[PDB]
Design an enzyme around this catalytic site. Structure first.
Site, mmCIF file in Angstrom:
data_model
loop_
_atom_site.group_PDB
_atom_site.id
_atom_site.type_symbol
_atom_site.label_atom_id
_atom_site.label_comp_id
_atom_site.label_asym_id
_atom_site.label_seq_id
_atom_site.Cartn_x
_atom_site.Cartn_y
_atom_site.Cartn_z
ATOM 1 N N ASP A 103 -6.224 8.153 -1.025
ATOM 2 C CA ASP A 103 -5.765 7.198 -0.012
ATOM 3 C C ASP A 103 -4.640 7.778 0.773
ATOM 4 O OD1 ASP A 103 -7.503 5.344 -1.226
ATOM 5 O OD2 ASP A 103 -5.936 4.831 -2.630
ATOM 6 N N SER A 137 -11.370 10.365 -4.911
ATOM 7 C CA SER A 137 -11.004 10.231 -3.518
ATOM 8 C C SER A 137 -9.485 10.004 -3.432
ATOM 9 C CB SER A 137 -11.773 9.084 -2.892
ATOM 10 O OG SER A 137 -11.409 7.867 -3.487
ATOM 11 N N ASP A 178 -12.005 7.698 -8.829
ATOM 12 C CA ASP A 178 -13.260 8.342 -8.443
ATOM 13 C C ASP A 178 -13.112 9.729 -7.786
ATOM 14 O OD1 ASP A 178 -12.544 7.937 -5.785
ATOM 15 O OD2 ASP A 178 -14.310 6.828 -5.228
ATOM 16 N N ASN A 222 -7.483 8.319 -6.166
ATOM 17 C CA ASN A 222 -8.311 7.270 -6.781
ATOM 18 C C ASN A 222 -8.997 7.834 -8.016
ATOM 19 O OD1 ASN A 222 -7.806 5.267 -4.778
ATOM 20 N ND2 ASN A 222 -9.201 6.325 -3.384
ATOM 21 N N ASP A 238 -16.065 -4.147 8.962
ATOM 22 C CA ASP A 238 -17.267 -3.682 8.226
ATOM 23 C C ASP A 238 -18.030 -4.761 7.411
ATOM 24 O OD1 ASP A 238 -16.397 -4.066 5.537
ATOM 25 O OD2 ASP A 238 -15.774 -1.981 5.237
ATOM 26 N N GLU A 273 0.823 -1.213 0.000
ATOM 27 C CA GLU A 273 0.000 0.000 0.000
ATOM 28 C C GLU A 273 0.869 1.281 0.000
ATOM 29 O OE1 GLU A 273 -3.010 0.219 -0.634
ATOM 30 O OE2 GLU A 273 -4.083 -1.514 0.009
ATOM 31 N N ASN A 326 -8.890 5.476 2.715
ATOM 32 C CA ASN A 326 -9.444 6.234 1.628
ATOM 33 C C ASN A 326 -10.519 7.215 2.141
ATOM 34 O OD1 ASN A 326 -11.302 6.100 -1.098
ATOM 35 N ND2 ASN A 326 -12.283 5.122 0.680
#
Ligand SMILES: [Cl-]
Ligand SMILES: [Cl-]
Ligand SMILES: [Pt+2]
Ligand SMILES: [Pt+2]
Length: 129
Positions: free
Chosen positions: A52, A50, A48, A46, A101, A35, A59
């Protein structure tokens, strides 16, 4: 801050990540490796919109507030810049919520593609813990 392998493993273990929800310590270290390469300051954008953040590339769409991610949550109730501290507490605490989650460590696409089903114990090999 750029951690060493065993340095990170030890910090993560001290913070209660070793076998958290059944994910042995080597899973977390392998995830950090692929990562951020152990670097608390890592940021990546990202597709989209967003971003990280941190050692475990947590994120902004769901987990932290960076002030710039339209239609996004802050489920760990933190500024995303808290995830870049040399102290990993907030990355760790936030990851415990992420991994609880429903999807486990599959929420980290690098863990799923690079760590899942591998000899993850190797990531903690030789470390004083
Ligand atoms: Cl730390
Ligand atoms: Cl913690
Ligand atoms: Pt620590
Ligand atoms: Pt802790």
């Amino acid at each position: 801050k750029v951690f060493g392998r065993c340095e990170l493993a030890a910090a993560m273990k001290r913070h209660g990540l070793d076998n958290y929800r059944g994910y042995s310590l080597g899973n977390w270290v392998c995830a950090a490796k692929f990562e951020s390469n152990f670097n608390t300051q890592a940021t990546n954008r990202n597709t989209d919109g967003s971003t990280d953040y941190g050692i475990l590339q947590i994120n902004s769409r769901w987990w932290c507030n960076d002030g710039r991610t339209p239609g996004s949550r802050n489920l760990c109730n933190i500024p995303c810049s808290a995830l870049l501290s040399s102290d990993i507490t907030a990355s760790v605490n936030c990851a415990k919520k992420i991994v609880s989650d429903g999807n486990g460590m599959n929420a980290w696409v690098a863990w799923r593609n690079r760590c899942k089903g591998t000899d993850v114990q190797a990531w903690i090999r030789g470390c004083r813990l």
